[PDB]
Structure formats: structure tokens, C-alpha cells
Design a protein around this nucleic acid. Structure first.
Lengths: 99, 127, 151, 83, 208, 100
RNA sequence: AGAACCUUACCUGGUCUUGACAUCCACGGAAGUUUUCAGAGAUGAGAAUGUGCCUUCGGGAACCGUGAGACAGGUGCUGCAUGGCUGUCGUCAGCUCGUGUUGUGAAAUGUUGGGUUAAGUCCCGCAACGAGCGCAACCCUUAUCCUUUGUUGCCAGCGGUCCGGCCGGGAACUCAAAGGAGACUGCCAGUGAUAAACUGGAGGAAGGUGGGGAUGACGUCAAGUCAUCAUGCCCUUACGACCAGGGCUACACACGUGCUACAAUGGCGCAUACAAAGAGAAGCGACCUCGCGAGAGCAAGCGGACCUCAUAAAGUGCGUCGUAGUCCGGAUUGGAGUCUGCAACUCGACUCCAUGAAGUCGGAAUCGCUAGUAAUCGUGGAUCAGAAUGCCACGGUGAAUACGU
């Protein structure tokens, strides 16, 4: 089975990507597993915002890396190649792994 | 046939199932006395049942995750209450009166930059 | 505070006897949020006390409390140049609390070994009308009496 | 202290110098900066002027000084008294 | 240093990001560095061309730049002569295949950054700062800004004691997150010192 | 930071890049309990001979824009101050002010 | 958001001077690759390979070498020349403007007054009428529900069992995200000026801004920062650059902020339960073997809801100690060692064995906190080779009190 790990910072974008991937899968092949949402990584950062000194003065940023696990149960001739061909929107790291 | 209610309190998440029976309580494949060493916890889990005389009438299977002991107990109680509500739907008023239907929304307040804790400010001095 | 009075928060009764007062006492006793240990101690105190005086566990405790409750306490107004301590009739909710607190203090003070034992001893003293808490109460009363002119 | 498996530490150059001295049989003081160098059995008898940051201070090596380092016998700070 | 940055507070809601790519902790810093480089280069090059926003977007080991500029004609030059030239240098800077797109900025009086730049330029060529500010404000208003604020600070008219002056017109709500507040800044490196120019331009509120 | 400092850092990095294979090998040799004493000694001495700037524990992480040694962040390769600026500008992808 | 070296800006010596870092020509050499002796090292002297993209051949672009200067360089001075960024009063409810009107005018009015509010919040009046910046709302998070999607997450009901959700499976529940619903004084009664509101109650997971965060008006302090950065006199064979060692860790003393204690609500021993949130490829490192232990060896699983860090601790049960400077307390020092690292002397952390200071709740005075708060208990992260009792995060247990001004 082809497991697909979509990773992105924007959630909407990721969602869009996932849908597209599903569409790509579903026309060619059959029995797409589904878009399973894994836990989001909220990598936080604190920094001092003064140039020199004021320690209680701080900004707390974060990067929300979202995960989408799409799986394809039956890899056909037409489907996998189609998937390979299909480039998704920018800012969405997709990894594809069969078996 | 088994009825159900979800329990939640602090970071605990109880899964209470109500069935008709003799009144044996199992929490994560352990007895009430085994799982909760604390008397208070036991009391809290039995409270709703005590309030509405169905201690002997119904068995309940529970599995709980997260939080500590007291929190877990609270969650369990909540779950039980929910189950009761589902099952009878005419005991609601009593439950409300008791204060068990209410999800206790008190979470731990986050630590805040500047402060040592949620509210403890560090030691001040003019000089 | 200035703006708004607020409703006192809900307190659960203790599992052994099913009492609010007892629970409150236990809470008062407690330190570092170690409630369980404190409650155990309280229970121990009760049991010993019960053994000593007969009666029940709860009833005896109540009796003990009764001998250390203050009718009247004082407060500092200080409107003049020098300070005037003024007596005030201390309300039902507060009086009960105060007695408990005093008892706890006495227990803490006491030279006996285990905490629970000390507590029990204190309770016994209260029941009999000697000891530390009782003395404190008397002092409080005495002060009020002295300053009865102010009202 | 240093691990036993690693052995003792001595600066290579210093060691070489010591060897040379031994070969010669001379007793002119060897000025050295390697304060971190451990003293060796063969160094006994030699005067070796160890740097203290500022100046080279002469250290006549003895049987008792072997396990120690050269910087131990060349104090850097110079405190007499507050009054 | 009272105020929060108006762009920065709104990135999740009404404002988008400039650099728009994903990368793991391994390659992220490098990517950032690359972005910084390319942007810097672009600024250096297209100073005379009125450039507002460089948007970098790298999918599949290939960098896509998008230059928002008021006058494409100067940035493009002859059709695909200057752009092409830019591209190879961009690629070199990155170390990947480059692709430059050029968005045409409609209404450069309403683009805040551009306005700021203009103001700075004016300052440099020794105009009355106040008159410049007025012009900036007025023009934006004319163009259909719901509001605009501009602020200039330090060594104004070469005066020994530095001060800040600012002109607002219309409404410029900063606490309101849903407000499209185009904020940007610039610096006039005059004979007496630097003169910092801030400008806020309120396009309107977004409803979603 | 100064230019000079930056240059030094760069040099150090270069050295590290150069001498990694050898240094690592030497380290391995030194570690290896199943080995000759003399060999080990040689390795130890060999290491000393190699340049100091060849060590990776010599090089300090500085900001990639300003060269500021302190307040550094690894993910961004930037000092706090610059990082913040980047965030404000929209230049760091995904990064926005966090509240919870 | 981490001084052994580095960092480092300081000291001591040893050295360099178009230079460590750039651009420019001139012309000597392909770059680079390997290795040798002296030196603390910086540097100062040797042996091997190569000639790629193109020439009516006066040669070129990358990358070393030398000399000239143009210049580089400066964590040098001025934050009282500046920008940017920051603190602060203060998340205090304020601060203004246009037009009108009043006053010779500075100014006033609006913005005051009656009520009310967390709020210049809202209503009513009124020479004001309007507007803006702020107080509110929009944003994140947390509390309830629903829909969607179910692996690496889940196990209610089914069969099988090595009694492990592990394996058939199931999509219920938890959980995971994505999208919706929900709270508005909307509904009820009374008080109120026919009001804005207030007081209570009904429902509800939540009630009157539900809890928390982000958000900081005009301005103030010639507040802080020229040593992040940028930027408007001074040094330029040295106030620049390279190096090794030392210092930033000094110690009659005074202050600030913390940790650990002084014990029995405890210490010690044995058993045993319940988290959350994070990090991880020059990385996290199971299992197994060895070591009293720090660790060592071997070495899977894993860019990770999968594997690893990783046993939560307080707690609970049973035993012991019995108020002692103690089986409290752990400083200090001796020995021996482990790991990181070219390198632990100055000056790392941790381990083992020994050693066992002061300290029995602290003078004048002084700080924090109104709830999942304080108090207490552990856990993680950043910087980081190594080096936290600090900082930033996470959950556990969990109070007291608020009469009032």
C-alpha cells in the first residue's frame, strides 16, 4: 500500500493538497484509504525583543507543522504513475512510500 | 443494550459504560478499591449513584486515561452522570442540583514569561 | 475587595463521616497541598479522641470546637492619635474557622511526637477546657472585655 | 584528574627539552610555559623556570613533586594583604 | 517600544507570508539565508524600479521569485532581456533553478512601502519633509484609502534636537486584527543623519 | 560582530570540513580498547599535532546576517533580534506570534 | 538561550602591515591535492601532481603569489547628533481633531451634568454637531456538542488466543485535526426616569468580558541600547590583524535574586499506582552483556501519534527511626574514577568510598498570591562537545481568606 505523508505550515493549503491527491488517486485506481489527520507539531520559540536589555520583554513565536496521512490500498499501473506526474502546490512537502 | 457517558476533568478522560446488574465497578480491569487507593476518589465516583438510588441496580465498566488520581476520579464521576442522563433522562434535575452535570472547566493556568508561575511574581525590591 | 462581594466556593464533605466542617478542618490542617496525609492525621486524631472521651468521633470534635469558639473578637480602628482596639461580634462562618485555626496552631506548637497524637491531645484539652487554643480564646475575649467601652 | 587509560600529560616539546637536558648532564634552568605539564621521574634534579603569566619562576624538582604538574609550583596571583 | 508590528500580528488572518515554503529543521536555516541573499540582491538592483514586495516560493528544488513592482517596464526592460539576466543571478545566489515572475502593482500611492520609499527619496533630495508627508497622505486619500498614517523621525530639517512628526488622515485601526493595514518602513540617509519613515495604509476590513 | 571575527569563524569551519575524516579516525583509534598502547599514544600525539581550529568544538554559532555570538537560534541560523525582524516582515515561513 | 580553548571585546609576551575580511589593475603561477624540519603557536624553509571553458595567439574567467597605492579594518568616542528596537507610568481609560459657538486673548465648549459600566461602556439631557486614536469586538487557546476522516491512535460488541489490542476485525468510544453549532442579559421576574442598566432564576457544558493569552492610545522619563544591526570625531607599521598562555571564576567585606535545609504533615528501606508537554540524524539510542555506580561494549527501531530520550515524583501499603544537632542537614575536604573535549592545573559535570560545617524557623524590617491561584511534587525544551539551583514551557496534588474601604 502507498502511504502518503503531507507536511505543511499552512493548514488550508495542506487540506487543499490532500483533496487534490485524493482526486488523483480515485479516478485512476480504487479504494483510496482516506485523509487521516496526524498530530500537529507546534514548535515554539521565545526570544528577547530588546536590542540590549529587558528580559521580561519577550515574543513567543511558533511554527505549526500539520501532518496529513493519505493511504492508497491498491497500487494499479495507471494510478501510481499519475500520482508521480502530479506536482502539488508549493509549501507542501509530500512524501510517498509504497509498502 | 449498554448505555454510555464520556467523562472529562483536568487532563483525564473516562469512558463509563452503564449496564443493568448487581453493582460491581471495574476501572481498567481493576476493582474500585484496587484502582483508587484514596477514599475521597471512591466517594466521588460513588456520589452520583448515591444521589440517585441505583448503586445495586447497575454494573459499570470504566476505562480512564490521563491526569492524576483526583482528576481521574472526577472525570469518571462526570462520565457516570452522563451515562445516567442518557439512560433515564428524568434524573437530570437532581444531577444539576448536585453539581455533577457541570464539566469542571478548571485547567492548570499556563506559566507566563516574567513570572515564576501562572501568577507568582518574582521577589520585588525598591532597592 | 472594593468592587464586588463573591459567593464562597463549594466544599465537599469528608468521605469517612460525611461532614463539611470536618473537611474544612482537614483543609486547614493540610500543608503543601498534601490533603490525603492531613486527612489521615485528622482521622487518627478523631479515633484516639473518640476512644478517650467516648461519645462519637464527630460529636466529640464538635464539643471540643465549642469550647474554643470566640463570641467576640477585636479589630484596630485607630481613628485617634493612638490606636483603639474595638470589639466586634464575630459571625457564624468565621468563628468556626477561627477556633479550628487556633486548634491547629496549638497542635503545631505542642511537644508531643506524632502530629495526629498532638491534635488529639489538643482536642481533649479543648473538651476539658484547658490547653492552648482555649487560652488564646480567653485572651481574645479578655481584650474585647477590656475595650468594651468602644462600640 | 586525567583518566588513567589516557596516561599522564606532558607537552611534547617540554619532554624533548627534558630529554636533551638529561643527555647533556647540564643544570642550567629551562624556561617553560607548559604549566599544564605533569612532572616526570627523569625531570628530578633539573631546575625548570615555569611561567606564572608574568615571569619565569625557578622550580628545582624533587622526588615529592613527581605526580604533580609544573603550574602547581609557580603561583600566578600575588596577594600580600589587605592592610 | 510600545507598538506591535502591524504586518506581523496579522500573518495568520488577513496578511500572508512573503517566503512561502516548507522545510525540515535541516534545510530551513539555509533556505532563510538564501532568501535573505536573493532579496538583498533584488533590492540593490531594482532600487530605481519601484519595487514593493518580493515573494519567494520554492517547490521541488527550484526557486520561484515573484517581484511586486509599480513599473514592470523598467524591471523587464526589453521583453525577456533584463528578467532573464536577473534569473541566472538569482539561481546562482540560491544554487538551484530560478524562476522570476513580475506582478504589476496597481495604484503605487496606496502601496505603503512604495510611498515610504518615495518619501525617503524626497528627503534625500532636500525637500521640506512636512510637504512630502502631506503629499503622501493626500495622494493615498485621493486614490481611495480608507485611511493612511505616515510618520517621520529624527534630524528633521537638519536640526540638532531630533524629533518625530506624523500625519494621519481617515481611519487607521491597528488593534482591529481584521483590518487590512499595509504597514512598511524606510530610512533616508541624509547629510545630517538617518530619517526613518513609517507609513500605515488602511485598505479596509476583511469579512470572513 | 566584527568582520575579522566572522572571517575567523569561516576559517575554523573550513578547517573542520578539511580535517574531519582524519580527526575522527584518530579519535576512534584512541577510544578502541582492543588496540596497542603505543599506537594509542601515537594517536593522542598525532591529534595534538593537528591544528586547533580543526576541532568542531572550537567554532561558535553566530548569526548569519550580523555575526552576533549570543542569542542564537539553530533552526533559523539567526540571532534573536534578526529572527524577530524576519518574523515581523513575513520572511520566516509559518512563524507567527503564539498565544495559548 | 550557557566564559576551559573557542567565545573575547581584556592582560602578558611572540608576530603581521593594502593587510584576517572586499573591489581594482599590473604581471609571477592553473586552482587544489598530498607530505618534511624548526617553533608555544602564529609562521618560515622542502618533495609530488595539474595546464579546463578560447585565440588575424599585445591573452583571458575561476584561485594562489608579489608591489604600488586608491582603500580595507576598528565590540574606538558621542544613545545629550540619530534610525530601529526596548522598558516605563499602564492594558491605566484616557488623548485629540474638524466645523460651529463663547471669550480682547491664553483658552473654553464638545470631553461637563443625572444615572450606569471593567471601560470617554451605554442611555438621557445639554451650543454643540460630528470624527479619529484608544475601550469593546475581530485573532489564538481553553470548557460542551455535532459532522467528516480513522493510522502509527482507539477497543464498545463480535470470534480466536502465547491473556499483550496482539490478530481477524470493528468503526462505536477516547484521541487526533479540519469544518460547523453554542452565550447574545437572548428568555423570566422585580428595581429603575416610559431608559441605559442593575438584582436575582430558568435553561445550559459554559452567565453576564465564561477562564487564560496576544493586543500597549496621545504622550512621559535628552529612560536603555553607537557592543546586534544601521547611522551624522578619532586611529590607520596601529585604538587594525594572527598566535600561544593567562584573565573575565580573584576575596577583609556589603547588597540583590535563587536552591537546600533546620525535620516525624518527616528521614531511610522494600513493594506499588496515576500525567502532560516536548526533543531527536556530526541526533535520540531499546534490548542483551559487563561495571557497586557515573558509564562501557555490542547494536536494533526511528527525520518519528510507530522507535528512542522515558522509570514521572509527590502519593498508596508494610516496616523501621522516637525529638537527639539525630538514621535531621548536607557544606567542606581526602582518595579513587567516568564522560565530553587537541586539552578539564588555573576552571567542567557526574559517580563511588570516606569526611559530616553552619543550621533547632531567623533583628529592624520586607515580598508574592483571590483558584486549579498560592503552596508543594516531579517532567520537558532552548543555548549547548561538555557545562543550570537560571530562563521558557508541561502536567500532578491542591488550600486559606476577602467583614469591609
Amino acid at each position: 500500500r502507498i502511504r502518503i505523508r503531507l507536511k505543511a505550515f499552512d493548514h488550508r493549503l495542506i487540506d487543499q493538497a490532500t483533496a487534490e491527491i485524493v482526486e488523483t488517486a480515485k479516478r485512476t485506481g480504487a479504494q483510496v484509504r482516506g485523509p487521516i489527520p496526524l498530530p500537529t507539531r507546534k514548535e515554539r520559540f521565545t526570544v528577547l525583543i530588546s536590542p540590549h536589555v529587558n528580559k521580561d520583554a519577550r515574543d513567543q513565536y511558533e511554527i505549526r507543522t500539520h501532518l496529513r496521512l493519505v493511504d492508497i490500498v491498491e497500487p494499479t499501473e495507471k494510478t501510481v504513475d499519475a500520482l508521480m506526474r502530479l506536482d502539488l502546490a508549493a509549501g507542501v512537502d509530500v512524501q510517498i512510500s509504497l509498502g | 443494550n449498554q448505555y454510555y457517558g464520556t467523562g472529562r476533568r483536568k487532563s483525564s478522560a473516562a469512558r463509563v459504560f452503564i449496564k443493568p446488574g448487581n453493582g460491581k465497578i471495574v476501572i481498567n480491569q481493576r476493582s474500585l478499591e484496587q484502582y483508587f487507593g484514596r477514599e475521597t476518589a471512591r466517594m466521588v465516583v460513588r456520589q452520583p449513584l448515591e444521589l440517585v438510588d441505583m448503586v445495586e441496580k447497575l454494573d459499570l465498566y470504566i476505562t480512564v486515561k490521563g491526569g492524576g488520581i483526583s482528576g481521574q476520579a472526577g472525570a469518571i464521576r462526570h462520565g457516570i452522570t452522563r451515562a445516567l442522563m442518557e439512560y433515564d433522562e428524568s434524573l437530570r434535575s437532581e444531577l444539576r442540583k448536585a453539581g455533577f452535570v457541570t464539566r469542571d472547566a478548571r485547567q492548570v493556568e499556563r506559566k507566563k514569561v516574567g513570572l515564576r508561575k501562572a501568577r507568582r511574581r518574582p521577589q520585588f525590591s525598591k532597592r | 475587595p472594593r468592587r464586588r462581594v463573591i459567593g464562597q466556593r463549594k466544599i465537599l464533605p469528608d468521605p469517612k463521616f460525611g461532614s463539611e466542617l470536618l473537611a474544612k478542618f482537614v483543609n486547614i490542617l493540610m500543608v503543601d497541598g498534601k490533603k490525603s496525609t492531613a486527612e489521615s492525621i485528622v482521622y487518627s486524631a478523631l479515633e484516639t479522641l473518640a476512644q478517650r472521651s467516648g461519645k462519637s468521633e464527630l460529636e466529640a470534635f464538635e464539643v471540643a470546637l465549642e469550647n474554643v469558639r470566640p463570641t467576640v473578637e477585636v479589630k484596630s480602628r485607630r481613628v485617634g492619635g493612638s490606636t483603639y482596639q474595638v470589639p466586634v461580634e464575630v459571625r457564624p462562618v468565621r468563628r468556626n474557622a477561627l477556633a479550628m485555626r487556633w486548634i491547629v496552631e496549638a497542635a503545631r506548637k505542642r511537644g508531643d511526637k506524632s502530629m495526629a497524637l498532638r491534635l488529639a491531645n489538643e482536642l481533649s484539652d479543648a473538651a476539658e477546657n484547658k490547653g492552648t487554643a482555649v487560652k488564646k480564646r480567653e485572651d481574645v475575649h479578655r481584650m474585647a472585655e477590656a475595650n468594651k467601652a468602644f462600640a | 584528574p586525567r583518566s588513567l587509560k589516557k596516561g599522564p600529560f606532558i607537552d611534547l616539546h617540554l619532554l624533548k627539552k627534558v630529554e636533551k637536558a638529561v643527555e647533556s648532564g647540564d643544570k642550567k634552568p629551562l624556561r617553560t610555559w607548559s604549566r599544564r605539564s605533569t612532572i616526570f621521574p627523569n625531570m628530578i634534579g633539573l631546575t625548570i623556570a615555569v611561567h606564572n603569566g608574568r615571569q619565569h619562576v625557578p622550580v628545582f624538582v624533587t622526588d615529592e613533586m613527581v605526580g604533580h604538574k609544573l603550574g602547581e609550583f609557580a603561583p600566578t596571583r600575588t596577594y600580600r594583604g589587605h592592610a | 517600544g510600545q507598538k506591535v508590528h502591524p504586518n506581523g500580528i496579522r500573518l495568520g488572518i488577513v496578511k500572508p507570508w512573503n517566503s512561502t515554503w516548507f522545510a525540515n529543521t535541516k534545510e530551513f536555516a539555509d533556505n532563510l539565508d538564501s532568501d535573505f541573499k536573493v532579496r538583498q540582491y533584488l533590492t540593490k538592483e531594482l532600487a530605481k524600479a519601484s519595487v514593493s514586495r518580493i515573494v519567494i516560493e520554492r517547490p521541488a528544488k527550484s526557486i520561484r521569485v515573484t517581484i511586486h513592482t509599480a513599473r514592470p517596464g523598467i524591471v523587464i526592460g526589453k521583453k525577456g532581456e533584463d528578467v532573464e539576466k536577473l534569473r541566472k543571478v538569482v539561481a546562482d545566489i540560491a544554487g538551484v533553478p530560478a524562476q522570476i515572475n513580475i506582478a504589476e502593482v496597481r495604484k503605487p500611492e496606496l502601496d505603503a512601502k512604495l510611498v515610504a520609499d518615495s518619501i525617503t527619496s524626497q528627503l534625500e533630495r532636500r525637500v521640506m519633509f512636512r510637504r512630502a508627508m502631506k503629499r503622501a497622505v493626500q495622494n493615498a486619500m485621493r486614490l481611495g484609502a480608507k485611511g493612511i498614517k505616515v510618520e517621520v523621525s529624527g534630524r528633521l530639517g537638519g536640526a540638532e534636537i531630533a524629533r518625530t512628526e506624523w500625519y494621519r488622515e481617515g481611519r487607521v485601526p491597528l488593534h482591529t486584527l481584521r483590518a487590512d493595514i499595509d504597514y512598511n518602513t524606510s530610512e533616508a540617509h541624509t547629510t545630517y543623519g538617518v530619517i526613518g519613515v513609517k507609513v500605515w495604509i488602511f485598505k479596509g476590513e476583511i469579512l470572513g | 560582530a566584527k568582520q575579522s571575527m566572522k572571517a575567523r569563524e569561516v576559517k575554523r569551519v573550513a578547517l573542520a570540513d578539511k580535517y574531519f575524516a582524519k580527526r575522527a579516525e584518530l579519535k576512534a583509534i584512541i577510544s578502541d580498547v582492543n588496540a596497542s598502547d603505543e599506537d594509542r599514544w601515537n594517536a593522542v600525539l598525532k591529534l595534538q599535532t593537528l591544528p586547533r581550529d580543526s576541532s568542531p568544538s572550537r567554532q561558535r554559532n553566530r548569526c548569519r546576517q550580523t555575526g552576533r555570538p549570543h542569542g542564537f537560534l539553530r533552526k533559523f541560523g539567526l540571532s534573536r533580534i534578526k529572527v524577530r525582524e524576519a518574523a515581523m516582515r513575513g520572511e520566516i515561513p509559518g512563524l507567527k506570534k503564539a498565544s495559548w
